[PDB]
């Protein structure tokens, strides 16, 4: 019930004959109790390990849209190393 991380038309910068595609969708995740074996390599012993991939554009051309300013146009999408999760 949650969409594959694929390309999707962005109406706001997209304009007929000039469709702007953005990467967005779903990736696999996993969180479980930190295995003791690893709990020892830790400087700061957390307690819930988490494996998590996140939807990202793997190829993106840079184009310019109707209002002077230029945007990023996505050409492909692949679940990859997450970088903004951390909180």
């Amino acid at each position, epitope marked *: 019930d949650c969409p594959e991380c694929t390309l999707q038309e962005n109406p*706001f910068f997209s304009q007929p004959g000039a469709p702007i595609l953005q990467c967005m969708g779903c990736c696999f995740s996993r969180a479980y109790p930190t295995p003791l074996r690893s709990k020892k390599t830790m400087l700061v012993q957390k307690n819930v390990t988490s494996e998590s991939t996140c939807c990202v554009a793997k190829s993106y051309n840079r184009v310019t849209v109707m209002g002077g300013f230029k945007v990023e146009n996505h050409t492909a999408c692949h679940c990859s190393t997450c970088y903004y999760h951390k909180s």
Partner: antibody
Amino acid sequence: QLQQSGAELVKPGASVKLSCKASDYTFTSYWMHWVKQRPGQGLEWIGEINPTNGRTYYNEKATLTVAASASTAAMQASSLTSEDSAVYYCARRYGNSFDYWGQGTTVTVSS
Amino acid sequence: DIELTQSPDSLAVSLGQRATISCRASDSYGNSFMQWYQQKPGQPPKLLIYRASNLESGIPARFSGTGSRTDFTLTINPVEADDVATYYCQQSDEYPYMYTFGGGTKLEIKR
């Protein structure tokens, strides 16, 4: 050019149509979307149509259409009650804004 | 989740006078552009200035806007007899995709 045509009557029942004929150049290049304005109040967006692909962008019973040949959109309202039935304008989008607007259309209910 | 709320519901300024009619918006989520439209009794709206401060071709030197985040206004140096109408602000949003209006700061020029 942007010729939006609008009659207004029909009981609190099932289906009314609407149209926005247009001209002075190339329809297959700019968007297209209707806006509803109930009297003595501001208007609010209802739905877009990529006059190119023909795909729809509504908001949260308004199946909209377009004919590249007839050069015109078509807001089709169903379940015509009080909540419905006011002045319906057809507009264009030129850089994320709307530059041109049709003349207007009004469509009221009865008892 | 966007509540555009204009401040002056019915600005009572006379000829050749100050004009301010602010419109506020509903922290960070997606991109967005404000818009100021001029609709009058009888005729369809007319986009006045685009984006926040820029303006349209065919519209005077007078009409201007200023703002950046939540509170942007449409100022008028010399209010005249021809500029008789309600002014609607608008905000084109990014992902919570929708075009919304806030109502109108109907202008009435003093006898």
